[PDB]
Amino acid sequence: KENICIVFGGKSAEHEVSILTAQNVLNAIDKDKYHVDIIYITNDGDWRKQNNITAEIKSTDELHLENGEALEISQLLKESSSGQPYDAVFPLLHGPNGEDGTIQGLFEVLDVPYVGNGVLSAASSMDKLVMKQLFEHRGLPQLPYISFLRSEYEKYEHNILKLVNDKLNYPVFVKPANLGSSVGISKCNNEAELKEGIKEAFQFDRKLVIEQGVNAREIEVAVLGNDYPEATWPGEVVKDVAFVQLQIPADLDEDVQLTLRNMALEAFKATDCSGLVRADFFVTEDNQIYINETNAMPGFTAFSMYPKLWENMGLSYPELITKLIELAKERHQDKQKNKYKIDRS
Amino acid sequence: KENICIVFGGKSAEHEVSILTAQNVLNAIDKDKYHVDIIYITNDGDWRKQNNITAEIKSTDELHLENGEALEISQLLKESSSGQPYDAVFPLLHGPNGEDGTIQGLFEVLDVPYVGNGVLSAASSMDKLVMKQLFEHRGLPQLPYISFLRSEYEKYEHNILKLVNDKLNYPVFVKPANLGSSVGISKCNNEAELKEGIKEAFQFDRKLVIEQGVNAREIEVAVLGNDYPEATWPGEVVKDVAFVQLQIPADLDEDVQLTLRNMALEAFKATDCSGLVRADFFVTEDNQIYINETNAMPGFTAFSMYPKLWENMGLSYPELITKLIELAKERHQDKQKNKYKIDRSHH
Ligand SMILES: Nc1ncnc2c1ncn2[C@@H]1O[C@H](COP(=O)(O)OP(=O)(O)O)[C@@H](O)[C@H]1O
Ligand SMILES: Nc1ncnc2c1ncn2[C@@H]1O[C@H](COP(=O)(O)OP(=O)(O)O)[C@@H](O)[C@H]1O
Ligand SMILES: [Mg+2]
Known part of the structure; x- marks a missing residue:
């Protein structure tokens, strides 16, 4: 059995989406295969830990939230309540206080294996200009x-x-x-x-x-991977005017769909992402394509675009979640093989 | 009076150079302006705090702390010896486990004000490929x-x-x-x-x-500031063989030295630095200029290039330090001043 920790909340008023996602994510984890603790981060920035989720979560009363163990940020955030090091920590708390990239720095310093984008790619995609210079250099329209x-x-x-x-x-x-x-x-x-x-x-x-x-339709692609990323077919928000319902696959030409897939893979690399990204494009009437942004920690509820797009390809929500965890372990281990291989030269 | 924390050491190759630099900084700092605490981090993640330094440290072995204040990382950075939060934390240590930008991340999360570059800028200048893409978009050779x-x-x-x-x-x-x-x-x-x-x-x-x-000379420029940065005259790292020794100012003709000063200022902005950067250049005998790299946390010894190039402009090592601290204050207050403004407006 493996040990996981879901970190959520945050200083923002995107707080409540963060709680919803936490709920979805907890209920889609097979408690027979994973020991899960959670840490909630208050508006005021405090860290509260609740140990060993084993029941399903039917609502927010059942989350202790602010009334967990007052937790000091420390070496211990590495330690699970089973007694074992966490095999992965899952940060579900969008672009924190300061910037995205910050909490990932905290985890790197503490040597905790975490899901998703690291520092450079989370920070770079919270900065619209740098992000644009990287896509330009990668050749993306x-x-x-x-x-x-x-x-x-x-x-x-x-x-x-x-x-x-x-x-x-x-x-x-x-x-x-x-x-x-x-x-x-x-x-x-x-x-x-x-x-x-x-x-x-x-x-x-x-x-x-x-x-x-x-004037464009907004079209989105989920990608998942570390060194060998894969990209979904695209989907869209169902509407008749660009001036919630979703269309997966998006109504578009077969080829426009392939192109967008490939672009998404290129956008992933442009920022040197790990784990996941969602690439969002504008597609005009005569199918002109422009990349708008990548998103390092996208909506991850049960009905969020990023999960639904992987559902289109037969990867269910729980399998998505498990897969993100294995990618997190893979990544932490390659770092330690390199940190070691380095130190011995 | 103002409360400052020097955080030095690391898990790194440069661990001792970090200690040496701690001694340098501790001795140039005016203990009649700043209350100073120090956090030693060993090559084991064994963070150790020592409070209220008011003595002119003779050897670099005084800086091998046998012990810390018992508390966790979070207690050690959110309160100074004096009880109020820190005015400024000064990281003199790379930032090991997936390298630079990380310890900055830590400081952002604890909402501690710190000297030097931010997450994005410290991370970018360590990825030579991303760095190079930002220098290119900006027009640098x-x-x-x-x-x-x-x-x-x-x-x-x-x-x-x-x-x-x-x-x-x-x-x-x-x-x-x-x-x-x-x-x-x-x-x-x-x-x-x-x-x-x-x-x-x-x-x-x-x-x-x-x-x-x-084949070129190694020529370096020191930059200091947040939104209104200034650059020094260049110096040269003097060597008969590339495969220590500084000439400040560098033996280069005047327009060249003018070109590099402005190129340093552009390099600082391509990567969106704060506090300081040291821009490193290659200059051929034909006076052909290429930027090699920027360095977010350059050597900061009393003898190092960065401090010395400020000395040449009339800014001494103690003033330089006082200036990096003020910059770290402005930048923190500025962030927080934007935070409240954002919170305020409710369309
Ligand atoms: N160039 C543009 N053309 C049309 N709409 C835009 C454009 N830029 C932004 N928008 C609209 O504003 C929204 C927010 O912009 P975006 O770049 O997606 O920033 P963020 O989603 O990070 O706030 C988008 O969903 C989009 O509909
Ligand atoms: N393209 C090059 N041509 C000549 N010498 C080089 C070149 N690249 C690096 N060097 C030498 O190797 C040394 C170290 O590499 P550098 O590019 O400065 O990054 P780092 O200091 O991070 O290793 C430099 O001091 C430089 O003098
Ligand atoms: Mg170098």
Whole structure:
């Protein structure tokens, strides 16, 4: 029997999705094969541990949450309540406080084997600009964009707006580079607008992307692997306007589907991901494809896109979960073979 | 008065150099400005805290702590000897177990303010391939190079070897992407030597970079700041054979030295550094410039290049230290000041 720990919660108000996912994930683990502990991270940033989940979880009362063992962050986060080192820890708490990448650093320092993206790829995909430079270098098509720091806008305001207006068709989107799923995003149909959208954006962040806008369907691909990743067929959110229901496989040409699969595999490598990523694309009417973002820790509930896409290929939710754990162990072991092989030269 | 923590050691090859640097920093720090605590981390993850340093440490063996404050990592970083949170934690230690950016991660999670680069920047400057992609997008000159993963190498050996000849000129250097200033590196004068190098490196790493060897000088620039960084004049690492000794300022003509100062500033932004970076360049006898690498946590001894290049601009070692601490404060306060603003607006 193996030992697992699910870390969840977080400082965010994406807190409650984090609890739901924890629930789904716990109930899809075969307790006859896995010893599971969980750690909950409060809004205020405290860590609470509950030991040895063995029953099914029918609701949130059954989670102790804030009233677990007040846990000091320590060597012990490596130790399971069976008495044994954790074979894998599963962080289900999106892009924490500071940034994604941070908690993965905590685990690396503590030498705890964890599921998913490591530091570079989790950090790089929380940063919209770096992410875009890596996809460009990998050759992936993307909408036209411009970026700059606050300090650069403070002394080249005329130049920057000329650049926008010259290489970019309104409407454009202003996006803070370092926040996910959030604030400072504004549609700008003209320079007056643009100018205040940037002003708006810079109350929250030091770094912006300005992006040319399109009408597209949003299409998504799940990938799973370490060195030999595999990609799903794509799926989409079922709608008639780009201005919850899901279509898997997405309604698209056979070839557009292959292309998107391959792009997703290339996007995975561009960021040097481990475990998983979800690659999200914009696909226009005449099938022009643009990569929008990769997502290092995507929605992972029972009905989340990322799980449903693997269901399309006969990998059920529990098997997905087991597979992510084996990929976590594989990865931790190759690191230790290298950390050792290194030290002996 | 302000509360500071020096955290030094590691599990690393450079463990003693980390101790040496701790002594350097502890002695230049004005104990009439800062209360100072120290966290020793041995090559066993045996974190040890010692409070309130107010003495001018003579040997580097004083820094081999026999014991820590009993508490766990979390208690040791969230409170200073004085009881309030730290103004600034100064990591003088690489960050072992999957290398740099990790200990920063730790500090972010405990919400502790710290000196030097962030997660993304410390991680990027350790991945030579990602670093190189950011320098390229930014417009900086680089030596011809080819990168690939182990799996690409097992699928397509031939075609890559072909490319190496089609693009590079021997001798080439084979470099692992993710190991630090470490082995697995090699010059390779021919395809048989390249073949072995691929092999040697793949034992330590799953991703490599092959780069055109050059003949050039080793020329380094020191950068300091957050959003409004400044760069020093260059210095040269002086050696009759590349396979210690500094000339500050470097014997280079003026526009060249002007070009490198600005190139350092661009390198700092390509990787989105904070606090400091040391930009390393290759300059040919023909005054041809290529950036080799940036270094997020350069040597920081009293004799090291980075500190010395600041000395040349009139910023002494104690001031330099005081300045990295203030930068670490501004950057923490800035983050937190954005956090509250984000929380505030409810559309
Ligand atoms: N260039 C664009 N064209 C059309 N819609 C966009 C564009 N950029 C962003 N959006 C819309 O805003 C949403 C958020 O942008 P995205 O880049 O996905 O950032 P995040 O999802 O990290 O907040 C997207 O789902 C998309 O519909
Ligand atoms: N392409 C090259 N041509 C000539 N010399 C090189 C080349 N690449 C590396 N070297 C030498 O090897 C040394 C170490 O490698 P470097 O690229 O600086 O990374 P690191 O210090 O992380 O090992 C350098 O000090 C440099 O002088
Ligand atoms: Mg070097």
